[PDB]
Amino acid sequence: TSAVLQSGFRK
Amino acid sequence: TSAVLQSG
Amino acid sequence: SGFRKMAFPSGKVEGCMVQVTCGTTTLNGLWLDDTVYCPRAVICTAEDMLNPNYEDLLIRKSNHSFLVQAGNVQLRVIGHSMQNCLLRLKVDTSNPKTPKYKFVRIQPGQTFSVLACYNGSPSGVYQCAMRPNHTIKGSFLNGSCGSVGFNIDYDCVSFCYMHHMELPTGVHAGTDLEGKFYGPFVDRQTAQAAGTDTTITLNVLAWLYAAVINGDRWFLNRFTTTLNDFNLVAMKYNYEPLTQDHVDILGPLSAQTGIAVLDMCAALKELLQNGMNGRTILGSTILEDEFTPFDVVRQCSG
Amino acid sequence: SGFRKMAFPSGKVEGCMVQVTCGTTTLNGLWLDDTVYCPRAVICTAEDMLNPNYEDLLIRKSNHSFLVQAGNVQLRVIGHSMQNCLLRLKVDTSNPKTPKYKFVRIQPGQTFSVLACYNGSPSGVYQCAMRPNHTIKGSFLNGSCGSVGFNIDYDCVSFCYMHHMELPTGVHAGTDLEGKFYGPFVDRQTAQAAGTDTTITLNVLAWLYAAVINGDRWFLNRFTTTLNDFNLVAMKYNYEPLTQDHVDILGPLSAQTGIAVLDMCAALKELLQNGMNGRTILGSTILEDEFTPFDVVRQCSGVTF
């Protein structure tokens, strides 16, 4: 599988 | 064998 | 994996810790606004501890008798009064670092964070649960008297515990911020011991749900069980009996993951009867019970 | 009188956490003096997270591209530069809560306190160790990017970790406060896998000493062993080979208890081949490997900050 950059979302 | 009120 | 015994950020509590001294006895105190809270034990000398008469001991004290300090600054006490096992000392300065707060009495099974302190200075923070027998398995050295247990809902600190002593069984006893003890214990060095402790069943199921939502699913089975049969088993292994109210609480966690509570009970039952035979559940090798349903929901989504 | 996973009080670090937002990408930032540190991943956009050419994405950004918030207030960025996997956003306001601090690159097996954050706001703090495979078994959800790991010395905060991503192992990878990664990981959404992990032998011994220091010493025996003979049993159980240097790190603990390191190993060797036999050490049934010799000292001596 692939890694995940754990950033967020603001809208 | 007894409770200790842990104050300094 | 991806599951840790998380404590709440202690910053807001740190800014309220102070040192309260009376005679030669010293310990921690909570400084909120213009009041300092501390265990009334501070006014007892070694001998007094065997069977103190707090009314008697307090009336012989004046404000001058209390040495409260914030770091290296003497805080002046302009009033004092006793409330159950706590002492409310009035100080002539308001603590600007005072966070939004509440005094709540938690129920056994609930979890909270402890800010271990010594001489009014922070030493470390850890998460723990209020055991069914009202005691707490803490890492409380002595002089930690006055350290507080708390929860943080948004930016509001809910103080729920104030450490008092260590029981001969090795665990710890304390009160809420109103001075009422959690458990049949008293402010006195005497023979004491909490009732029989039990594993917190509600939490273990929340934990197993945490493993499932986190990918782990090996422990599930096709078996079935009724609420009563599950309890008859659980009681054998010293687990708290599970009520309809506990299963309803596990509702959210049930919806998510799509596993019926009774079926999850069917899995735990098998677990209680067959160890894990080399397997680990969410990194652990034992059924963890210091995670409430709320905790789990918070850590896997919040 | 119970050995829990003590974390450092987190007040000092909480006063350095800020939220950083680039367009619709938001994460956590570390605010020290007039600088904010954060993962460069912030200048990433949703469709460009596989092989983002950072140098290029940064070229089309300006100070106005960054929205740095601390509470309700907005911190005006007046400069930006990249350092390895991190961005150094200069702000016009020096952080009033900056604590005395240092940036230090931690080593495998060592521990630190993590302050898990979301939207620039602190949610929880816990203990973890830098695994031998260079990863960390933590608890981070999306948005945790930017969270930092630290230790404390008297008055100094030693920032040693900034979280970046989660591996398919359910494990995590991050950088030091200089942006250099721990391990062979890169901050892109490609297929990367953690190497096989081993038990931190140094820490297990530290733990055993702690057990002894708290009066729980049934496991001790009358013999001693060699590093060779020990390592031989150790590899069976996947333990980190123990070195002479490790032995010296256990020096203080070994002197406080007066139990030679090789003596403790002989006890551990026996503890591995036989097992606890229903018995428990420090109220535990497993052999703990995430307590450094320092943590043991720290918790048993009630060190304050």
Swiss-Prot record, chain D:
Catalytic activity: TSAVLQ-|-SGFRK-NH2 and SGVTFQ-|-GKFKK the two peptides corresponding to the two self-cleavage sites of the SARS 3C-like proteinase are the two most reactive peptide substrates. The enzyme exhibits a strong preference for substrates containing Gln at P1 position and Leu at P2 position
Catalytic residues (UniProt): 41 (for 3cl-pro activity), 145 (for 3cl-pro activity)
Top-rank taxon, per record: Viruses
Coiled-coil residue spans: none
Domain Peptidase C30: residue ranges: 1-305
Chain ranges on the Cytoplasmic side, renumbered to this chain: 1-305
Compartment(s) of residence: Host cytoplasm; Host Golgi apparatus
Quaternary structure annotation from Swiss-Prot or TrEMBL: Monomer. Homodimer. Only the homodimer shows catalytic activity.
Function of the protein: Cleaves the C-terminus of replicase polyprotein at 11 sites. Recognizes substrates containing the core sequence [ILMVF]-Q-|-[SGACN]. May cleave human NLRP1 in lung epithelial cells, thereby activating the NLRP1 inflammasome pathway. Also able to bind an ADP-ribose-1''-phosphate (ADRP). May cleave host ATP6V1G1 thereby modifying host vacuoles intracellular pH.
Name of this chain's protein: 3C-like proteinase nsp5
